């Protein structure tokens, strides 16, 4: 009625596996990777049947690729790919590939229902998009190998080689739920060909793009746990999957809890004892002008601003020197809890300086929050142990700020790889001249931004191209196609204009003949095909 | 308890009510030329207790009226193959219908994510899913735009231009992806997922080629008619005015699965030499003794010459020409006037006449010329295609002949040929990128080519693969620049051009429907919300 | 380059639609349904092309069905269906149908990756499961209509009728994210055949089954907004979709924020000023590499004196220098209680008036490490939340740890006191041991009895799972022991004797239906008929 098992061999295999994992973790890949669980803990989570996900090889390829870039102080630069066509053409020029959540929202949801970048498509949407590209890469790699190996050695060496298998880094948004969600999301990403995934310290289901407004953060620890959870998943299912940690704390103005000491410096509160709960005041009025009045009266600021203000406008003898006692101990990076910072302020001034961040809460319950670049450095440093790349969303393409953040992070973790969003949400001809544009990536490369991506480039290139042709098409008919697309395709290298070959027809005619004993009457690229018009 | 009771009288009453509703439906001007081989009774019996109205049907109506006006004005609804929501959103500005390509779906949109050349060997639901992809995008952007408009004043509305996102979609059904029951289910999906019209081809499934690949196998005329009937049956049951397009690949095809249909017989190639035996079996015997490769192809090329392959009428003409007959030119004409591409004369009948006219049983064997798979050999051209066009026309709102080149003469031949017998038949034309277009035509002719075909009655024309190629060019070009000149490439090649050409997407937060959703957010949160997506801070104030 | 439009006809059509919506909303269906937006607001959200989702007809069918049940004080009782087989057989006996999230987690995730009931499958999982059943219902309805209408009137009246089209109510869990998520989730449910969906006041990152532990709640308002969002979606895309509101506050011990005044009564805090932040104390002990840790918590908790603020006020008065104590509690309790919605500031203010202390109370310090606040719900908390949701919800539902009649009455009475016409729903959970919890005489009548209290819709959530699980395990066992005899004996004979339609499985699956479609298209006749001479179902006549 059941199956028997050798209990001794069980333990033996368990122990064997524990050791295999310990050896795995000791590899150079994990040199900077903090793990808070044991190899024992992980082995227990695995099954009796080992599975090897090819995605992991692309993780390795990605890591080595980034190693060399870091050493040479140069950049793996890429952008957001839409579809199999993109990755097939990109592979000629670029050495990694970005799958964008923003683009997936508009073009690739698994319910087919589009949206703005809110990560409210179904969870499997981006994982499915990776497989979309993954499998295309694999297919075109397979096609090209057949094309090559049916040539002579003499002919091979003439015909160029494309590396279709560029590693993919994919948007995991905020992880699409709790820890168990994130494990399952990571599992899918691994199964469907992800070399690396990135994940952001926003609250789920308030999730914004990045250069949208009203961004809510989560406690530092909560997002650490997310990164741990990714790693836990990758450890169980056995991928060297790269983890990227993103922070939206440059611009964010809200946060879900005050629970984490590291956040306290940045939590905004009311200095005026007389101010009551704004949330409840609005609720009673509703059952604006009253808000803008309450805010002025409430005197909102960060607690240290409040301490400095007390000392500045106070009966204190040696004021400049007394700020510095406080600021040297209490600052963005200093991780000083609020109780602790109040205690010091009392020692230095003799007041319990009043501060209430409960009353400034939004109606949803979020606490108010003043991040900038230094907050982002704080969170960068915190994530760094858990994350192979670190990434700070910025409202502009500002070199100074990028340096501030890079310097800030590397001061505490000098070997940390950084990543930068080259966002089309910026107007790029407004933000800098073209001479600077050309060198901007390179310059950030020096600061240690080893991976950079234009998130929405695939969207926009396609959008321009289709709108432009549609316009021509409407005006001058088939001349538009000859002129705007097909001639240009021939004159530039573009492989797709011979689209039967590109799509893998001669590859499949191979499979057809092979199965039919060498010969077949229904050959797809035999005499008659209309691609002899492209010779 | 154990079951549910029903009024048997109300049942019959509702049945009869529905039968009448269907009869009234079928009598509408839409179906004026639409042959149906079943009764309204037959269809009503197939329906359920719960009526469902698929919005796709409204787009069918929109498509039919749109094509009516084009036919009347002798002008063209011209479009191309859309890839994704971005395409349809931008296309809607300029074009009035939309093509979903099976070829493109094979490479970019299979539901198994496994790409291919155009063999229709992705899973059946692949193109139906692609339509819904675009359908739902159309619906979404229509919804977005209506909110944008209706939160403006009447004064402001009238300044801001309107896009009709809801352009009717015509989608590739390949060869129907199996039998009759398959085709019903495939059509059902297309209707449910937003298809205004679908097209379907007289090739055999699972030998299915692109139109401009080689080794194309046809099916009997009747078999493909049954396919079209099956589409109509499905659309009738589930209640769509779905347009049906019939395609024939018989211009170029050289094979066919059966000889069963008398209409095909004229075109079936056979051996005139009694001495020639079964080629198929001869090859098999040579292969089993380990003759392979080019020495084997020698045996075929020898057998073919010896076998004297031709069409039976060529054989009759040949007998008379090289024969002891007095009045030869006049004797061919007796035969050709009775027996020709359009004449539907069976082989038995054509042999009988040849015997009357010559006194021979002229030898003809098309079994021996069969391919190893069992297909019969077949010599179509434009006239064969006209034959099949005419046959399909009763069952098909548009008719479509795949061509190896963009040849005006041939297009006229086919149009004239079909309209002679069915003068009110709408035609459709593939403006294929499988043609080299600067090799085939000068540019002056290019500009007017669509218009000229419009005169002949090609009311719907499409570039099948244009979406593929525009995207392919664009991404390759930018990737190249990007690799050479960094972020300057984006400023220069994409984003500036986007601003200058007025392309809506460069403001991509708005385009994607952020302000639309902020609407929904505030509305639900009682007017106000702290997490507004397009509030103060959004970086699209850099595009004002 | 664009399309022109009549600006006047635009406004006219807009206004036309606004009116159509206003008329729609005034129908008897919406008699108890609070809306916080205007018909103007909704019309603006719609597109130029109206779409009619058949699911909405099943919503109507469900509402009328429940109306009659409420009036007759009887119950629409059902359970959790797995697959097309279930709905096809259920339709004979039952009048509605439940699609379970729990079951979907184990059997029907769209990633095919199973799990316990954590709602961490992809969002479209349950919506897809409804369509699974929806389309089966529609198919078998279509099959049966053909079977009937190819009989004579004489023969029809002999052969029984099955109503396959039983309305479906489906698990939306906690909505699978924010407001925009919930709209999109509802849209899918409508498109895929949902008559009604239910939704729970748990946090999404932490979603438990109803009878798992460690349940985190969200603020009352937050879950109201969820229900509003469902309604907003249904209004835009034009369904009379029923909304069910669930509360897990009977058993839950945690909550994400204190922001909502209604919750304050129930938020647990420390009465001892000396107790510091438990969260941070644990963190400091853990970072030095400390069951010995759980010792530090259990010590801190005893020392901290955790309770609800009113317990703290009552305790002060009881053990205090006060003259008229019983009477002084009642001054507080009459003003401050589970249903009274009294904020904490307000309740402290009153306690000061009544005792002259600022009675110390700190609920920040008792927070879990994740940041959740501690929370003591029971049935009265659930009534509080029931009442709050009722305006927004066609049915109200309180998860319970046992099948206790008294508790069910407490909750029903409690809710109906303030909203007497509110329909209620009850989980008849297999998470209960049912032969341990009551005798069989009571079992038989338990549904009926709850029907009296106004529980008009009741469901066994996991019954489909368990019936199947028993059946397959039992047969597999027999099969393994006595071969094909097991099938003759355990399944196929019983199928014949019990009249189960599926044993003639070719007919049941709709073969004769499709042969119809085949012949019809082929001009009346076809050589490849599936149920022609040769089919081996003449062995079942
Ligand atoms: Mg993104
Ligand atoms: Mg195609
Ligand atoms: Mg459930």
**Ligand in nearest proximity to the CA of B99:** 2
DSSP lists the bridge partners of residue B297 as none
Q: How far apart are alpha carbons B13 and B507 in whole angstroms? A: 57
* Rounded CA separation C181/C363 (Å): 31
Tell me which H or E stretch contains B255.
Answer: strand B255-256
Checking chain C for breaks where C and the next N are over 2.5 Å apart, the residues before them are: 290
Question: Closest by alpha carbon to A82, among B493, B80, B467, B511?
Answer: B467
Are A422 and A402 contacting, i.e. CB atoms less than 8 angstroms apart? no
Backbone angles phi, psi at B339, to 5 degrees: -130, 110
Chain C contact set for B1 (CB, 8 A): 93
Residue C307's alpha-carbon distances to B257, C268, C336, C366, C378, in angstroms, are 84, 5, 15, 10, 14
> In CATH, what is the architecture of C261-374?
Orthogonal Bundle (1.10)
First to last CA, chain A: 69
Structure tokens at A73: 């102080």
**What distance separates the 2 farthest-apart alpha carbons in chain C?**
100
Q: How far apart are CA A530 and CA A528, in angstroms?
A: 6
Distance CA C381, CA C207 (A): 19
Token pair recorded at residue B499: 């601003």
Chain B contact for A281, CB < 8 A?
Answer: no
Please provide the distance, in angstroms rounded to a whole number, between the alpha carbons at the two ends of chain C. Answer: 69
Helix H or strand E segment including B191: helix B180-192
Residue C203, SS3? coil
Q: Dihedrals φ, ψ of B171, to 5°?
A: -125, 150
Question: Which DSSP helix (H) or strand (E) runs through B459?
Answer: strand B458-463
Beta strands in A180-314 (DSSP E): 196-200, 216-217, 242-247, 254-255, 269-270, 300-301
> C110: closest CA among A184, A51, B350?
A184
**Which of C142, C225, C520 has the CB atom closest to B47's CB atom?**
C142
How far is it, in rounded angstroms, from Cα B500 to Cα A35? 52
CA of A209 to the centre of ligand 1 (A): 6
Structure letter (DSSP) for residue A46: S
Q: How many CB atoms lie within 10 A of CB A519?
A: 16
Ordered alpha helix ranges (H), A413-486? 428-431, 434-447, 457-476, 479-481
Resolution for the entry shown, Å: 2.7
- The experimental method is X-ray
Q: Which residue of A has its CA nearest to B430?
A: A478
Q: Does A181 touch chain C (CB under 8 A)?
A: yes
Which of A121, A177, A221 lies closest to C120 in CB terms? A177
Q: Chains contacting B with at least 3 CB pairs below 8 Å?
A: A, C
Count of beta carbons in the 10 Å neighbourhood of residue C216: 25
Q: Pick the closest to residue C349 from C273, C264, C259 (CA basis).
A: C264
Class of domain B262-377: mainly alpha
Phi, psi angle pair for A255, to nearest 5°: -155, 150
| Contact flag A259-C369 (C-beta cutoff 8 Å) | yes
Three-state DSSP class for residue C247: strand
Contacts of B211 (CB under 8 A, 6+ apart): B201, B247, B249, B252, B402, B430, B432, B434
- CB contact, 8 Å: A340 with chain C? no
Which residues of B fall within a CB distance of 8 Å from A523?
214-215
**CA–CA separation, B503 and B497 (whole Å):** 8
User: Does residue A125 contact residue A106 with C-beta atoms inside 8 Å?
Assistant: no
First vs last Cα of chain B: how many Å apart? 69
From the list A53, A62, A29, the residue with the least C-alpha distance to A163 is: A62
Which chains have at least 3 CB atom pairs separated by less than 8 Å from chain C?
A, B
Q: Looking at beta carbons, which residues of chain B come within 8 Å of A456?
A: 508
Name the residue in chain A with its Cα closest to that of C286: A36
Helix (H) or strand (E) holding C244: strand C242-247
Contact between B490 and A518 under an 8 Å Cβ cutoff? The reply is: no
The answer to whether B35 and B394 are in contact (CB under 8 A) is yes
Angstrom distance (rounded) from CA A368 to CA C188: 35
C-alpha C464 to ligand 3 mean position (Å): 13
* Contact predicate C234/B520, CB 8 Å: no
C113 reaches B (C-beta below 8 A): no
Helix (H, G, I), strand (E, B) or coil at A171: strand
Residue contact B55–C57, C-beta within 8 A = no
Q: Cβ separation of B38 and C520 shorter than 8 Å?
A: yes
SS3 track for B259-307: CCCHHHHHHECEECCCCCCCHHHHHHHHHCCCCCHHHHHHHHHHHHHHH
Q: What residue in A sits closest to B436 (Cα-Cα)?
A: A533
| Cα gap C190→C179, rounded to integer Å | 17
Task: Please judge whether C51 and B55 are an interchain contact, meaning their C-beta atoms are less than 8 angstroms apart.
Answer: yes
Active site residues of A: 209
Q: Pick from B255, B148, B198, B230: which is nearest to B398 by CA? A: B198
Nearest to C125 by CA among C169, C170, C86: C170
What is the residue whose two structure tokens read 């941070």? C280
| Separation between Cα atoms, residue C225 and residue C537, nearest integer Å | 55
CA distance B57 to chain C (A): 11
For B268, list phi and psi in degrees, rounded to 5: -85, 120
The shortest CB-CB distance from B161 to any of C2, C41, C161 is to C2
- Which of the following CATH numbers is that of domain A261-368: 3.60.150.10, 1.10.10.850, 1.20.950.20, 3.30.390.50? 1.10.10.850
- Cα–Cα nearest to A298, from A320, A323, A269: A269
With a CB cutoff of 8 Å and minimum separation 6, the contacts of A333 are A374, A377, A378, A381, A408, A412
| Residue C200, beta-bridge partner list | C246
Cα A531 to Cα A146: distance, rounded to the nearest angstrom:
19
Q: Torsion angle, CA of C108/C112/C117/C119, rounded to 10 degrees?
A: -100
Listed in sequence order, the residues at least 6 apart from B85 whose beta carbon sits closer than 8 Å to its beta carbon are A106, A107, A114, B133, B134, B137, B140, B141
CA of B543 to the centre of ligand 1 (A): 20
Binding site listing of A for substrate: 100-102, 210-211, 246, 421-425, 455
Catalytic residue among B22, B186, B204, B210: B210
Which of A176, A240, A164 is CA-nearest to residue A202?
A: A176
């Amino acid at each position: 009625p059941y199956t028997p098992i050798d209990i001794q061999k069980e333990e033996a295999d368990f122990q064997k596996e524990v050791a295999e994992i310990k050896k795995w973790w000791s590899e150079p890949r994990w040199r900077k990777t903090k793990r808070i669980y044991s190899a024992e803990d992980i082995a227990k989570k695995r099954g009796t049947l080992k599975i090897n996900h090819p995605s992991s090889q692309q993780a390795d390829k990605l890591f080595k690729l980034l190693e060399k870039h870091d050493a040479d102080k140069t950049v793996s630069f890429t952008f957001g790919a839409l579809d199999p066509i993109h990755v097939a053409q990109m592979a000629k020029y670029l050495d990694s590939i970005y799958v964008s959540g923003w683009q997936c929202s508009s073009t690739a949801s698994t319910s087919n229902e589009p949206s703005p970048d809110l990560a409210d498509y179904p969870m499997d949407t981006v994982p499915n998009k990776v497989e979309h590209l993954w499998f295309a890469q694999l297919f075109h790699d397979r096609k090209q190998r057949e094309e090559r190996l049916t040539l002579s050695k003499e002919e091979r060496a003439k015909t160029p080689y494309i590396d279709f298998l560029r590693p993919i880094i994919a948007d995991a948004d905020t992880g699409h739920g709790g820890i168990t969600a994130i494990i399952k999301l990571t599992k899918m990403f691994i199964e469907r060909g992800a070399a690396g995934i990135h994940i952001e310290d926003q609250a789920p289901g308030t999730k914004k793009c990045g250069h949208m407004a009203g961004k809510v953060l989560v406690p530092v620890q909560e997002h650490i746990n997310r990164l741990v959870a990714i790693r836990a998943s990758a450890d169980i299912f056995g991928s060297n999957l790269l983890a990227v940690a993103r922070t939206d704390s440059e611009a964010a103005t809200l946060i879900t809890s005050t629970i984490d000491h590291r956040d306290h410096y940045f939590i905004i509160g009311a200095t005026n004892p007389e101010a009551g709960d704004l949330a409840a005041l609005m609720a009673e009025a509703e059952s604006a002008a009253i808000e803008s009045e309450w805010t002025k009266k409430a005197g909102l600021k960060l607690f240290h601003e409040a301490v400095i203000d007390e000392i500045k406008n106070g009966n204190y003898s040696n004021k400049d020197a007394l700020i510095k006692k406080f600021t040297d101990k209490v600052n963005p990076l200093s991780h000083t809890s609020h109780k602790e910072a109040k205690k010091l302020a009392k020692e230095l001034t003799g007041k319990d300086i009043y501060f209430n961040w409960d009353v400034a809460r939004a109606r949803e319950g979020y606490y108010r929050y003043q991040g900038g670049t230094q907050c982002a450095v704080m969170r960068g440093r915190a994530f760094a142990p858990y994350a192979d790349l670190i990434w700070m969303e910025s409202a502009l393409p500002d070199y100074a700020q990028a340096k501030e953040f890079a310097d800030g992070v590397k001061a505490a973790v000098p070997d940390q790889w950084l990543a930068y969003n080259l966002s089309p949400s910026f107007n790029w001809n407004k933000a800098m001249p073209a001479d600077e544009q050309e060198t901007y990536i390179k310059r950030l490369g020096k600061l240690g931004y080893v991976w950079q991506f234009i998130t929405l480039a695939g969207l926009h290139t396609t959008a321009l191209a289709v709108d432009d042709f549609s316009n021509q098409y409407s005006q001058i008919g088939m001349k538009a196609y000859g002129q705007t697309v097909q001639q240009p395709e021939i004159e530039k290298g573009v492989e797709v204009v011979k689209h039967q070959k590109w799509s893998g027809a001669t590859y499949i005619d191979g499979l057809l003949k092979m199965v039919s004993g060498g010969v077949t009457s229904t050959a797809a690229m035999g005499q008659g095909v209309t691609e002899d018009q492209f010779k």
